[PDB]
């Protein structure tokens, strides 16, 4: 079939409420280990600083006088004191600050993004949910936090305990690998819950996700609007002349 279904869940209880449809060229591509390699390695070269520096014989401090006469001493003839053959000499072919980043076609970088997103789909590690994807922390704790009654060491010790037991029930915690939450914007509860308890997973903003982040944890929990906005920006090879992008098959029973 040309299109593949996408079931939308309610994050708290994981209840299938809606059904969307995407093209097979979005979440059902073949696993190309050579394309994911070029994209994963293309991102590592960009995050690299590449500022290492070393001094050559022309940059090492000191004078450029001849150390000893050309001949007559019985020792090996020598020139300047900064030669690589000296103690404090400079490294000939040493490192220098340069640009380690490489290039990658926009179409190939988008195919790797949609290839990494289909690898999670066919394996069941892509769990899309409705909007408002945030940890449903207890109301009592939320009221005390705002009140200021709870000290920092208590406000943090509780979140770490809640997120831990909440992920163990869902089988999404450190036991079953980890889980990555991808939202459109930054949410206080979600991003704060995993900042104190990161062993259970992590949270990322749609603009902060990379091809490598979609292949690191056990599952990828992404929002409905975030996913559509993710494929709509990484389908250059497709949109050139459209294909099903978020076509709703089963509407939410309001």
């Amino acid at each position: 079939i040309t299109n593949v279904p996408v079931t939308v869940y309610s994050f708290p209880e994981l209840e299938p409420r809606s059904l969307e449809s995407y093209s097979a060229r979005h979440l059902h591509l073949p696993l190309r280990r050579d394309i994911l390699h070029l994209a994963v390695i293309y991102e590592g070269d960009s995050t690299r600083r590449g500022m290492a520096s070393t001094k050559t014989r022309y940059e090492v401090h000191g004078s450029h006088k001849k150390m000893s006469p050309q001949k007559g001493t019985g020792n090996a003839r020598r020139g300047t004191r900064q030669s690589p053959l000296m103690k404090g000499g400079g490294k000939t072919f040493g490192p220098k600050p340069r640009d380690f980043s490489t290039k990658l076609n926009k179409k190939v970088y988008d195919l790797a993004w949609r290839t990494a997103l289909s690898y999670r789909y066919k394996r069941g590690e892509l769990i899309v949910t409705e909007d408002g994807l945030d940890l449903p922390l207890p109301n009592d704790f939320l009221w005390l936090a705002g009140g200021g009654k709870l000290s920092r060491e208590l406000e943090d010790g509780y979140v770490r305990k809640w997120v831990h037991e909440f992920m163990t029930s869902l089988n999404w915690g450190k036991e079953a690998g980890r889980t990555t939450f991808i939202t459109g914007d930054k949410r206080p509860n979600l991003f704060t819950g995993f900042e104190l308890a990161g062993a259970e997973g992590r949270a990322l903003e749609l603009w902060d996700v990379d091809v490598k982040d979609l292949l690191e944890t056990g599952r990828i929990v992404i929002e409905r609007s975030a996913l559509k906005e993710m494929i709509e920006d990484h389908q250059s090879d497709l949109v050139t002349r459209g294909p099903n992008l978020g076509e709703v098959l089963v509407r939410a029973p309001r």
Binding site: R33, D34, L36, V40, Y119, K212, L215
Partner: protein
Amino acid sequence: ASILASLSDNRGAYHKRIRKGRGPSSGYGKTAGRGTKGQKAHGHVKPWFQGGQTPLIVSHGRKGFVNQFAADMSELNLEKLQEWIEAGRIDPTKPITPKEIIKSGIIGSSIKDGIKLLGRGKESFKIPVTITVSRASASAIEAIEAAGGKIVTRFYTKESLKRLVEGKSLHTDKPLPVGKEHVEEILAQARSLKKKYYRLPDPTSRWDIEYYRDPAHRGYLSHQLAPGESPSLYFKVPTGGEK
């Protein structure tokens, strides 16, 4: 195990690295494939050096010159214009102007000094169109008209072609009129546009004027001639008879 620990490029994409000066068994140990104590081992030999013998470009000399004033036309054939109309990528009912030829991708992305319509595959062209280009071959002008079309060669430049695609200039198949009896109509038309459009240039040199001033090329200045007058600004058609 993990996906990130099982990714790699195709085997045929990797190649052997030659690190010289790293032992005899590697194959490039001592001299690193340089030889034994020569100029090519101690220093560098110039690329243009032939041992001292005079090169051929000196014994023969350089031939010709590079024309820096020639226009770099973007060629367009009829077989490629027919394929675009059949694919719905060029509307034949509307005038086919450089703006519609450049944005359609038929001549590519680069914008050159002009567009010339060539007549490759002229026997299979039977679509009536109204095209406008900078030049056109004799075999393409008759093919466009044999099918029931109209062709007019206008004067363009590399800059005026960019303004036609950017919308900063409106396309017109007529030159700027001359005389005090046209200022009223020309000035009145500019005001109604409500936008500052750049005018398309007209030919200024002798050769350029003579090109668009003759009917063989369907130049947009050919209407300024008489049935007997010649396009050349200097030569005239001699008279026949005995006198």
